[PDB]
Amino acid sequence: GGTILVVTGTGTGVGKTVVCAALASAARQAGIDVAVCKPVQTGTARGDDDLAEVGRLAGVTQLAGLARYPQPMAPAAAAEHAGMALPARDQIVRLIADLDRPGRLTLVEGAGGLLVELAEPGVTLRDVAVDVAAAALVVVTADLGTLNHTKLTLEALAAQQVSCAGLVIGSWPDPPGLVAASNRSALARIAMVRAALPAGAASLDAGDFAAMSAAAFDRNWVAGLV
Amino acid sequence: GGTILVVTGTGTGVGKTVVCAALASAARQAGIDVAVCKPVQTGTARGDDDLAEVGRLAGVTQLAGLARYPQPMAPAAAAEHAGMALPARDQIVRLIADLDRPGRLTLVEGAGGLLVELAEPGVTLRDVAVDVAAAALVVVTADLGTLNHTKLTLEALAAQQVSCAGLVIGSWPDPPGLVAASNRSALARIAMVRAALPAGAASLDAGDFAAMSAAAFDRNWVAGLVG
Ligand SMILES: Nc1ncnc2c1ncn2[C@@H]1O[C@H](COP(=O)(O)OP(=O)(O)OP(=O)(O)O)[C@@H](O)[C@H]1O
Ligand SMILES: Nc1ncnc2c1ncn2[C@@H]1O[C@H](COP(=O)(O)OP(=O)(O)OP(=O)(O)O)[C@@H](O)[C@H]1O
Ligand SMILES: [Mg+2]
Numbered sequence: 001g002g003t004i005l006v007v008t009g010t011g012t013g014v015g016k017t018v019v020c021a022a023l024a025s026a027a028r029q030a031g032i033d034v035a036v037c038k039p040v041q042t043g044t045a046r047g048d049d050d051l052a053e054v055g056r057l058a059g060v061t062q063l064a065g066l067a068r069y070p071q072p073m074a075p076a077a078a079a080e081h082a083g084m085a086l087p088a089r090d091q092i093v094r095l096i097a098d099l100d101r102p103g104r105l106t107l108v109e110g111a112g113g114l115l116v117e118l119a120e121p122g123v124t125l126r127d128v129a130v131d132v133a134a135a136a137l138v139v140v141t142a143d144l145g146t147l148n149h150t151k152l153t154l155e156a157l158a159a160q161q162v163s164c165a166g167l168v169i170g171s172w173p174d175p176p177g178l179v180a181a182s183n184r185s186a187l188a189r190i191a192m193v194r195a196a197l198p199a200g201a202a203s204l205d206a207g208d209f210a211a212m213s214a215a216a217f218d219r220n221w222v223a224g225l226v
Numbered sequence: 227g228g229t230i231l232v233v234t235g236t237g238t239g240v241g242k243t244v245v246c247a248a249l250a251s252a253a254r255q256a257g258i259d260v261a262v263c264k265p266v267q268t269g270t271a272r273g274d275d276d277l278a279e280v281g282r283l284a285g286v287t288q289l290a291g292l293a294r295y296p297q298p299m300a301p302a303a304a305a306e307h308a309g310m311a312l313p314a315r316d317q318i319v320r321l322i323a324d325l326d327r328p329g330r331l332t333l334v335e336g337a338g339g340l341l342v343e344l345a346e347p348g349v350t351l352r353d354v355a356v357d358v359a360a361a362a363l364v365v366v367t368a369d370l371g372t373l374n375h376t377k378l379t380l381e382a383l384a385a386q387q388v389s390c391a392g393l394v395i396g397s398w399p400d401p402p403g404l405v406a407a408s409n410r411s412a413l414a415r416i417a418m419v420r421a422a423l424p425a426g427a428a429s430l431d432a433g434d435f436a437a438m439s440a441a442a443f444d445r446n447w448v449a450g451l452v453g
């Protein structure tokens with residue numbers, strides 16, 4: 001056994017891909033084996049491909065997924081439109097357990113939010129964390145409203161004994177602003193803020209990105225993921 | 227007393243005020259005496275004033291505030307920035323209890339989402355609904371990301387045994403996109419969708435807003451809120 005984390009987001013478009021990328025790239029630069037799994041990818045019509053973005057930005061080659069739906073909806077909504085069931089709960093859990101091995105950091109990127117249907121029937125990213133005993137990394141904004149959403153997600157995590165590996169602000173703006181600045185200290189007061197990626201990091205080339213990612217996360221913390 | 231409903235949102239800016247004004251208007255039309263209560267108001271130096279807008283739109287006069295903070299920030303931070311404290315619990319709860327009276331529908335509008343801090347320490351709108359025995363009407367969007375936001379909110383409500391009075395889509399676009407329609411349909415499977423206010427309802431005048439309101443809601447449901 002190794003270390004699986006689910007990476008989940010408080011909202012639409014908070015930067016969870018760039019955070020998996022970032023944490024993958026920081027953890028690869030610590031000589032850890034890293035695999036990112038995206039069981040369900042939606043929004044392929046407009047061209048989403050989060051595993052690819054983790055490949056380009058972070059250089060991970062163990063990139064595992066199971067289904068791809070064109071529509072930019074929540075998984076079940078993009079499958080109900082498509083006419084094709086979500087993966088079975090069994091496929092998601094065994095894909096992740098097969099990736100997982102001693103010494104490997106395994107990131108598991110949700111589709112949408114923590115409590116949306118990820119596999120048939122009605123089984124969510126939170127269930128999947130329970131089934132594989134993964135902790136949850138929560139991606140958050142700094143913008144107004146983040147506090148409510150973040151408390152809501154930690155409550156939903158604790159309610160099923162899914163540990164919270166911490167928060168990551170997916171976009172730290174420049175210059176902050178009073179709200180961004182206030183929310184960041186407040187978020188640090190209810191959970192540990194593992195990192196706050198600079199805005200626009202999702203366009204750095206592979207090398208610039210890797211230096212940012214190495215600067216974003218705590219050295220010992222990454223290493224301690226093991 | 228009467229019937230107290232807190233009206234909380236899944237997010238910032240989903241339409242809590244318009245929904246409070248619309249349900250008040252529909253309830254006033256049914257012959258139900260209505261009070262609208264905004265215990266904690268932020269953004270007053272931006273002109274924010276949810277109680278005023280509720281009068282502007284639904285002609286309610288039994289309005290009741292308590293705390294007002296200049297900054298458009300969360301109540302805790304707007305207070306700090308203004309060298310002020312948040313109100314106390316029983317200051318907020320006394321405000322609502324005073325309003326509660328048999329035959330009256332008392333609407334309590336939160337400040338942001340359900341778990342935003344309203345009073346010190348960590349006192350939320352949910353803790354307040356528990357104390358005044360209130361149910362929660364939840365205002366949502368149809369944009370993607372709503373199902374998670376609505377599921378997180380219902381879970382938080384159930385965790386303290388606060389009954390969900392239903393959902394209200396605060397803004398609903400005509401015509402509706404494929405994401406919107408799909409989300410609405412799925413929202414209805416999570417809970418009862420009491421209403422879906424047409425986009426731009428806040429710009430309506432007294433007359434149109436009242437008619438929009440009477441047709442936005444099921445008259446039998448609105449009737450049944452107050453025994
Ligand atoms: N005002 C805005 N400024 C910047 N980006 C915006 C804005 N409005 C919408 N977006 C979009 O939000 C998206 C950023 O979210 P991102 O793709 O990082 O989501 P995620 O949570 O990491 O992953 P996924 O969506 O794949 O689950 C971008 O496509 C961006 O263009
Ligand atoms: N420049 C702005 N001025 C006023 N409101 C703004 C502005 N920018 C964004 N908003 C948001 O749009 C929301 C829409 O008003 P409305 O009151 O109907 O929504 P709400 O869900 O009730 O939010 P609130 O609890 O803050 O009143 C405002 O609450 C506010 O959060
Ligand atoms: Mg992704």
Ligand SMILES: [Mg+2]
Pocket residue numbers: 241242243244276335
């Ligand atoms: Mg309001």
